[PDB]
């Protein structure tokens, strides 16, 4: 286990976003499901070229799984996955830029997917987050982080993936409506309904 | 005809985009499709929950219509449309905020799109752009600048669209390769291959 200093503007969005209130926060979702298609557009557009891109998983999917006994919202995408470089280095369109302005426009939460930093938004809603991803050119790694100004980065010896991404909100106690599948439904609909791959909510 | 100054940030913007050289010019075709595929998630949204917000018209898509005698290419949606007030405040989502700190991450120019100000890379190569636009709620206008500072809003007396927006893009002289069908097939492969909408090509 490796444990990582964030980003200057990185640990500063992420304790603005955990200390202060915000009422709209079903946009967290929004967001995720925002990344997963992105991560499947990409995966996708890579196998119109190279269709051996898909031997680690063909379908392209968005799976949401509510579970009220562990109180975690877990968002499951088949799309590109991510190396243990960008766990450790950040994706290169987030960055200070994006970050630093938005900040100063909070100082409504939802024009936080205009600059490229949604993911954050997980923080409106859990207190830790479990990003589980396995890229085709890497092993399959667990980031982590509970904010404090720090993530880890471990190898990922559990249940293989195959590629793509997995992120696991472990919910704040008063943010559990999010495993509730009539609420969840409402979001998709309100802010994802029109997203061009499956987006399948399972049952408990 | 009444005539504007822009807000101060986003003649900075227009500027910068207009004044420095950029190589990855081609991302403009990008932003005005994602615009449009916006335009077009945000009737249909409203068109779920009261079906009459469709009586200006039922179709939902995309058009691309290069000009080479006029050295114009057009972008046609069946979107949303905007209001006057729209085209004298500019959008809520294009504001100050998402403009200031694009311009310092820029002193890849791709990076506009995710500041929510990707209209404005239409100036990469356009000398003038006019967006005629349509809501529901309001009459067909014209809005139109050759940046310098300001634009133009006027009740427009042309062809009626019924709903949507046509930006007409009047190319600089060095730009023409974005008249050729080549060209625009290769760009929209590149990047706008999996918009929700059909976009189509109308070949001279
Ligand atoms: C399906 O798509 C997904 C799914 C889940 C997460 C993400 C995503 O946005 N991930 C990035 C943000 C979060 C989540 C995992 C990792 C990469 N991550 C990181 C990684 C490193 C950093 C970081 O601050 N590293 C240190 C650093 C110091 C100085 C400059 C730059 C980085 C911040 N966030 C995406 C795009
Ligand atoms: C299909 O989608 C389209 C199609 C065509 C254009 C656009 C778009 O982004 N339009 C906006 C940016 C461009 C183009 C039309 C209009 C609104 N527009 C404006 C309007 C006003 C201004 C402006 O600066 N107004 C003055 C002002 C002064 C002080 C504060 C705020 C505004 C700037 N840009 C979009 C979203």
Same mark, same amino acid.
């Given at each position: 286990?490796?444990?990582?200093?964030?980003?200057?503007?990185?640990?500063?969005?992420?304790?603005?976003?955990?200390?202060?209130?915000?009422?709209?926060?079903?946009?967290?979702?929004?967001?995720?499901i925002?990344?997963?298609?992105?991560?499947?557009?990409?995966?996708?557009?890579?196998?119109?070229?190279?269709?051996?891109?898909?031997?680690?998983?063909?379908?392209?999917?968005?799976?949401?799984?509510?579970?009220?006994?562990? !109180? *975690?919202l $877990?968002?499951?995408?088949? @799309?590109? %996955?991510?190396?243990?470089?960008?766990?450790i280095?950040?994706?290169? /369109?987030?960055?200070?830029?994006?970050?630093?302005?938005?900040?100063?426009?909070?100082?409504?939460?939802?024009?936080?997917?205009?600059?490229?930093?949604?993911?954050?938004?997980?923080?409106?809603?859990?207190?830790?987050?479990?990003?589980?991803?396995?890229?085709?050119?890497?092993?399959?790694?667990?980031?982590?982080?509970?904010?404090?100004?720090?993530?880890?980065? !471990? *190898?990922? $010896?559990?249940?293989?993936? @195959?590629? %793509?991404?997995?992120?696991?909100?472990?919910?704040?106690?008063?943010? /559990?409506?999010?495993?509730?599948?009539?609420?969840?439904?409402?979001?998709?609909?309100?802010?994802?309904?029109?997203?061009?791959?499956?987006?399948?909510?399972?049952?408990?």
């Amino acid at each position: 286990v490796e444990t990582f200093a964030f980003q200057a503007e990185i640990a500063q969005l992420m304790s603005l976003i955990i200390n202060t209130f915000y009422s709209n926060k079903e946009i967290f979702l929004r967001e995720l499901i925002s990344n997963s298609s992105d991560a499947l557009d990409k995966i996708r557009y890579e196998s119109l070229t190279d269709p051996s891109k898909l031997d680690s998983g063909k379908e392209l999917h968005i799976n949401l799984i509510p579970n009220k006994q562990d !109180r *975690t919202l $877990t968002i499951v995408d088949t @799309g590109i %996955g991510m190396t243990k470089a960008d766990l450790i280095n950040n994706l290169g /369109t987030i960055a200070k830029s994006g970050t630093k302005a938005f900040m100063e426009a909070l100082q409504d939460i939802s024009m936080i997917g205009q600059f490229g930093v949604g993911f954050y938004s997980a923080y409106l809603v859990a207190e830790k987050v479990t990003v589980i991803t396995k890229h085709n050119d890497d092993e399959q790694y667990a980031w982590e982080s509970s904010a404090g100004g720090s993530f880890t980065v !471990r *190898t990922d $010896t559990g249940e293989p993936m @195959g590629r %793509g991404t997995k992120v696991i909100l472990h919910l704040k106690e008063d943010q /559990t409506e999010y495993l509730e599948e009539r609420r969840i439904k409402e979001i998709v609909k309100k802010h994802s309904q029109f997203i061009g791959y499956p987006i399948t909510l399972f049952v408990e």
